[PDB]
Amino acid sequence: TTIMAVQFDGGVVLGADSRTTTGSYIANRVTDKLTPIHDRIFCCRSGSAADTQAVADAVTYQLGFHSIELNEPPLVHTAASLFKEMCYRYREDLMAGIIIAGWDPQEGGQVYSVPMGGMMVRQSFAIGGSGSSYIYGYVDATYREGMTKEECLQFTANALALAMERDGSSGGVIRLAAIAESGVERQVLLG
Amino acid sequence: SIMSYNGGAVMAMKGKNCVAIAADRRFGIQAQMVTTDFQKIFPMGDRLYIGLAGLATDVQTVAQRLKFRLNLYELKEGRQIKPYTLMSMVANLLYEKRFGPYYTEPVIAGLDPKTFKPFICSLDLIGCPMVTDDFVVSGTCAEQMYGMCESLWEPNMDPDHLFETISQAMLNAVDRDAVSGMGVIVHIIEKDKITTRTLKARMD
Amino acid sequence: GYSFSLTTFSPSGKLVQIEYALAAVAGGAPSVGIKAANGVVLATEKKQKSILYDERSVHKVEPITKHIGLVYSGMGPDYRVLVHRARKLAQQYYLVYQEPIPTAQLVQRVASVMQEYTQSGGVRPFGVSLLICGWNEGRPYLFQSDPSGAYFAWKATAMGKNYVNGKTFLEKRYNEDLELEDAIHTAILTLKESFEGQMTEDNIEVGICNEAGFRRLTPTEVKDYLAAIA
Amino acid sequence: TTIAGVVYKDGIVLGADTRATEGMVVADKNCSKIHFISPNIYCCGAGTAADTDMTTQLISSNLELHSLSTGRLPRVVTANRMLKQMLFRYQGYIGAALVLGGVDVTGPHLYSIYPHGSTDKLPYVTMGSGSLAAMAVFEDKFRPDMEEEEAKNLVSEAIAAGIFNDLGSGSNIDLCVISKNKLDFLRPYTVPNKKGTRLGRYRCEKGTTAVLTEKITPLE
Amino acid sequence: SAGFDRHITIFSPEGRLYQVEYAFKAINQGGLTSVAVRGKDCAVIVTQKKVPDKLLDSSTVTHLFKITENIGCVMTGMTADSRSQVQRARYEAANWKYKYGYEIPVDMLCKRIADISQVYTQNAEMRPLGCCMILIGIDEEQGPQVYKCDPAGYYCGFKATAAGVKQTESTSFLEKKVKKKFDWTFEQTVETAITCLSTVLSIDFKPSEIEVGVVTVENPKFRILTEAEIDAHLVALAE
Amino acid sequence: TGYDLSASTFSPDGRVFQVEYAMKAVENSSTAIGIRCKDGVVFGVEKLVLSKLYEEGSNKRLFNVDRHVGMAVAGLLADARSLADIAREEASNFRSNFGYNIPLKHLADRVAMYVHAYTLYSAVRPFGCSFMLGSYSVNDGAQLYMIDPSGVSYGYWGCAIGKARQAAKTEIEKLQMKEMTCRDIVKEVAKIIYIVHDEVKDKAFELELSWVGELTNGRHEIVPKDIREEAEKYAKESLK
């Protein structure tokens, strides 16, 4: 449910809960909610599941085919435009809370947000999910422009901690992802 | 319901070396009957019949469509058809109308073409098969025939007691039923011969 | 200078573009296939041009289902096409009837496909003759087809280079009653009659059809058996 | 209907219960809910029976076709991709609650499929109407990398609790075990519920029913 | 013979068709040479360039086309058929990746490309894409692979592989060279590729004319060598 | 000499004579060259007035495909117009689908596939055009490509299309091409075009010069050639 992406100077840092529920019963307790597309670009999803999974698979197809034909590493804004087109074309049928982030060689770390409608915007931080309203309450209080990697990790840790603590649908376990020029760093925290 | 538009009840029962299938005779609109000689059990090759219950439109339409495909199969291959093949054929024919469904519950009862092995199965309105060993039923009335056949069935049955068991079951479950009645036709078949008897049912 | 193309008959004869495809079949690599009492044996003759080629990549003996074997004598590039068509068609039969397709129905439908390509007027026929076999309902079968759409039924036959010579050996050597091993023995005999002098574990490629199912033999047992079988 | 799945130290143990109800009346006492896909991959269905049946036969046909075209053992992820693409292509109209399990070269892989197209990789799943009791037994007594008889006892215990909860089955819980080399499949595993013996004899006699019109037809 | 003037794709008498065996030397109008070698857990492509112009670039004369991240290829023959065949290969590999969820093995790709060429051959009123394609890739449980695809649709694949203009001579050297049972320790492969092209063409030239594409089971990514390490291998075989 | 009829058929020696005849169709067309510098790409076309019936500003072979890409066509003009429309359409799809400027390699490959697809079948003929494609980007530099009538598309520093294909590149290649900015290259192309065919076969010609690079900040347009007037005051000094 609750997904989060914060950029910093070197790269970006993502994060999500897992706890995919249906109604009042938890169907699955732990989920890879964030999805690799390319080796340097992620997307994290919310809303309905099958919609975002099918969209992410087709975007993975188109983006991999395009970036192999260029024989160059892809852009992040490219993947954001692809998600924008596929979200906007079937807004009558899809429910996507897709948030695009990823480091780029030309443009560094970027974070794009695509909410349930199909608009595309560049932000420095993003929320997402039904239990994101709360950390959206204080993400304009605790955030400071120009963090380090560890400050972003501690920040999103406190964020997703309180989101999992407060919302009934949110919960489960904390997954993090750190994307920079150096590498891709995933980890599983609790606290 | 739409299943209770024209009534109907089809019972098939597997015996020891033989198999017995029976159905009702009544045809009519929701409460007004018309005739007592409406056919619901059709011959599909030798020692193998099929029974159809539900809306009579889908009964005759699916019966003629199945006869079409059946004769095409038996003319493309000189041999006669195995019952599982027919079951799969009826399943494919019903599943082609997944969202345009017929309102019918076909019941297949037949023998083995090589041996004397009996066979019964039933299908649902979208093509869900179900093979059993004792009996299958279809139509509007269900719980009556379930109670009767779960009361009266034996594993090893001579054809006479088979005939009397299916007779008593059909008579009592039909006489308790309202929209399906007005006589019973019974087909009791085996390797040697084919017997068709009609019972003196209550005309009420 | 006539016939040319596929839409019009000759003044008196036959369909010259099908006769030429049959000649291209007869100019192909040899093969032999024998129907015995319990099983059917297929055997081809697969020579690499150089010493460079690998014998684990391209396969002549090819299964259609778990109990239906099939070889050819012609061109692999068309062979694979009509193989894929027969695959999809047999799986469609098994979708419809939930039962493994009988070989006569396979040969009917494959013959319908080949016949549909012999129809007018822009596509060429296949340069492929099949040898279809399988063990359906106890009695095994053997069905040869041709580019013209026709089909037959054999006890033992051959196709390729010197099929006439191999067939005159088959008429003398083979009979009605054998087992699968004696069938393989006479099959490698009649293939060794016409092949080159160096016949190894890789120059031949043999699959059988027991009633327990199709079986495509390995180079281990093929080298064990043809290590101077007679 | 209560199906379950699990991953032991080598492979996958699947279970099922075979009461195929039609409405409110038990219509079947023996319905094979464990379906064939491949020699290593199997599948279970729940909800609408014929939808699960036709879909699993189509996907098994497609994987037999692909495997015979390729020439080696299939992968589970291809089956998963075909199933999720098909069920999303039907837009969630078809209700087919699937459990997918198989052992590839990479090892055991378990997937559960919800009929809109949402899939998950899990060490243990339960699906169906009485899936909650088996999920209770799983969440109580699961540990990673169990042994064989341990996993069999756990899945049998889970489906047994599903039968002692509502809408289980009279049936003798079906099991199937897939390893890297050894496939087993066991229909009459454990019978807890014997039918009560008849107390008399409601047998009819030769002529207790009036007959109106007879016919005899000989055959060959 | 003909006679029939072989204008369309039909069968001639006794017994061949002449369109495809005219397409087999559309490779020969390329004026180009390609050699592939599989000895061990590596695989090596080598192919020279014929650039007479100083106004012409050097990066965009590359014939090694990275199909996917683990599959490379090289092309000869006419350029348009080659590049269109390459985009068909990329599109169908991406179609594999979309449909089946994992990376395509190099065998199925050659089968699919051969089938496309056969459909282009079976139906008339289309030119049969007169270019030849050699593929390489690493597969698990099979090691490395080297395959060849024909314009006719006849794929095959084998140890020491060569197609282009002068490859009767190249296969003569590769029969006279792959007959001794030594192992091929990757510099044995690079040395035998450079020297087989150096004996077929007999030029013994700068490191700036040939292109070397390698793939190895240590880094399964396809990899194109640089002028420095090409020069290193060339002087490493210089005795 | 055959067997030269269809574009699907091969020859007894293995080549398509339709493609050769279409290649030497552009040989009779006007001379068009191009060259890039270290911060831009310069076009230049020897264009001729018929006799006195033109208007000096009609039918300009310097097209303008994308915001930063234009053509320098030579050959049949209407076929080049249709191909330019196809290139505009392809850049339109890319701008609509990915939100940024098309790389010239991808554009050239799509155009080469389109030209190859018109060379393939027997219903249609191959194109009778040969054109140039230049670009510039802040993260890519200057790129100049080249498409033959067959569909072979690769890159150059300098090129020439027309009669004097060799006779331009004889003295194109003696230019110190790397160390010059394009504002020198303007009068360089002026002198190169002015060298070939002053009065010999025809009566009079006229010069156009297109212009893309860093100095236009990524734009592509024709020079204000009247501004700095760099041909004629040097063309009259290039005759001696």
Side-chain angles (χ1 to χ4, degrees), chain B residues 95 98 105 126-128 130 143 150 152 154 161 164 168 171 192-200, chain D residues 22 25 27-29 49-51 54 198 202-205 208-213 215-217 219:
Chain B
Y95 190 74
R98 174 64 183 87
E105 288 179 352
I126 51 176
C128 174
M130 181 184 76
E143 301 177 355
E150 287 286 328
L152 298 178
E154 291 185 355
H161 294 171
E164 300 298 324
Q168 276 300 107
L171 282 176
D192 296 332
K193 54 175 173 295
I194 296 171
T195 300
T196 298
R197 294 191 186 95
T198 64
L199 298 180
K200 187 178 185 292
Chain D
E22 182 177 0
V25 177
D28 194 356
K29 291 181 181 179
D51 285 335
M54 293 302 292
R198 315 184 57 179
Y202 299 153
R203 195 177 282 171
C204 295
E205 302 290 341
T208 188
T209 304
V211 179
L212 290 180
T213 297
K215 187 71 179 179
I216 303 295
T217 299
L219 290 175

Side-chain angles (χ1 to χ4, degrees), chain F residues 4-104 106-138 140-194:
Chain F
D4 52 353
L5 291 174
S6 178
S8 176
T9 64
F10 279 159
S11 69
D13 55 356
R15 64 184 184 270
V16 175
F17 287 99
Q18 292 291 326
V19 180
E20 297 291 326
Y21 294 160
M23 281 184 180
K24 70 181 180 67
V26 188
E27 184 67 28
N28 296 116
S29 179
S30 67
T31 300
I33 71 168
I35 179 67
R36 71 180 183 179
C37 70
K38 63 180 178 292
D39 55 345
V41 179
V42 174
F43 289 158
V45 175
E46 184 179 3
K47 193 174 186 183
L48 51 91
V49 179
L50 295 173
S51 180
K52 199 177 171 66
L53 296 169
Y54 190 70
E55 201 182 359
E56 194 179 4
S58 175
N59 64 11
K60 295 180 291 295
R61 286 190 291 273
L62 297 175
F63 288 154
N64 200 357
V65 174
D66 200 74
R67 185 66 182 86
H68 58 92
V69 170
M71 292 169 78
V73 306
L76 297 179
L77 186 58
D79 196 4
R81 295 177 184 275
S82 174
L83 199 276
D85 282 330
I86 293 299
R88 292 172 193 267
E89 199 271 336
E90 186 68 27
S92 300
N93 295 119
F94 192 82
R95 182 66 56 84
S96 64
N97 288 320
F98 299 97
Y100 70 102
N101 290 319
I102 177 68
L104 195 64
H106 189 268
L107 179 62
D109 292 332
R110 298 293 294 165
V111 171
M113 291 307 111
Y114 189 76
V115 176
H116 179 205
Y118 276 99
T119 62
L120 287 170
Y121 295 98
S122 70
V124 294
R125 70 168 187 264
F127 281 160
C129 293
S130 180
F131 61 93
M132 300 286 289
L133 287 174
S135 171
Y136 185 76
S137 177
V138 294
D140 295 326
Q143 286 81 12
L144 180 61
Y145 285 161
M146 173 64 193
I147 287 94
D148 59 349
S150 70
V152 182
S153 180
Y154 58 90
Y156 283 153
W157 284 280
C159 185
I161 299 164
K163 270 80 67 180
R165 185 180 60 83
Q166 294 178 358
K169 70 185 179 182
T170 302
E171 69 274 17
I172 284 170
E173 68 177 1
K174 63 167 62 65
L175 294 180
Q176 191 60 254
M177 69 192 81
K178 301 292 192 291
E179 287 79 2
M180 296 177 184
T181 63
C182 277
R183 197 170 64 245
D184 300 328
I185 307 298
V186 173
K187 69 183 180 68
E188 297 294 323
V189 174
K191 88 176 83 171
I192 293 299
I193 299 300
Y194 190 78

Side-chain angles (χ1 to χ4, degrees), chain E residues 14-39 42-49:
Chain E
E14 283 91 9
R16 296 173 293 177
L17 56 93
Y18 294 94
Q19 284 293 315
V20 174
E21 61 184 2
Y22 289 169
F24 281 165
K25 59 187 180 292
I27 300 101
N28 282 312
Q29 281 90 26
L32 193 58
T33 291
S34 64
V35 169
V37 168
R38 193 268 308 275
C42 61
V44 174
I45 309 295
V46 57
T47 290
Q48 78 272 23
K49 72 187 67 68

Side-chain angles (χ1 to χ4, degrees), chain A residues 20 22 25 27-31 45 49-51 53-55 57 93-94, chain D residues 81 84 88 91 114 116-122 124 126 131-132 135 139:
Chain A
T20 297
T22 170
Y25 174 68
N28 177 15
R29 285 77 176 264
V30 52
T31 309
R45 62 192 187 272
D51 295 332
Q53 287 179 355
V55 168
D57 293 332
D93 296 328
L94 301 179
Chain D
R81 183 66 59 82
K84 68 174 74 177
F88 181 74
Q91 294 293 331
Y114 294 93
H116 289 286
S118 68
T119 64
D120 284 325
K121 182 188 284 186
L122 281 175
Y124 62 96
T126 62
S131 65
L132 303 169
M135 185 59 80
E139 192 68 24

Side-chain angles (χ1 to χ4, degrees), chain C residues 69-103:
Chain C
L70 197 145
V71 301
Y72 76 106
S73 299
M75 53 187 71
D78 286 335
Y79 173 67
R80 291 182 290 110
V81 168
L82 59 86
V83 159
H84 181 76
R85 182 65 58 86
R87 295 284 180 81
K88 186 175 90 178
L89 181 144
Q91 296 298 317
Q92 287 179 357
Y93 190 92
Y94 184 73
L95 286 178
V96 172
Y97 295 103
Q98 297 297 321
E99 195 272 325
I101 176 171
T103 63

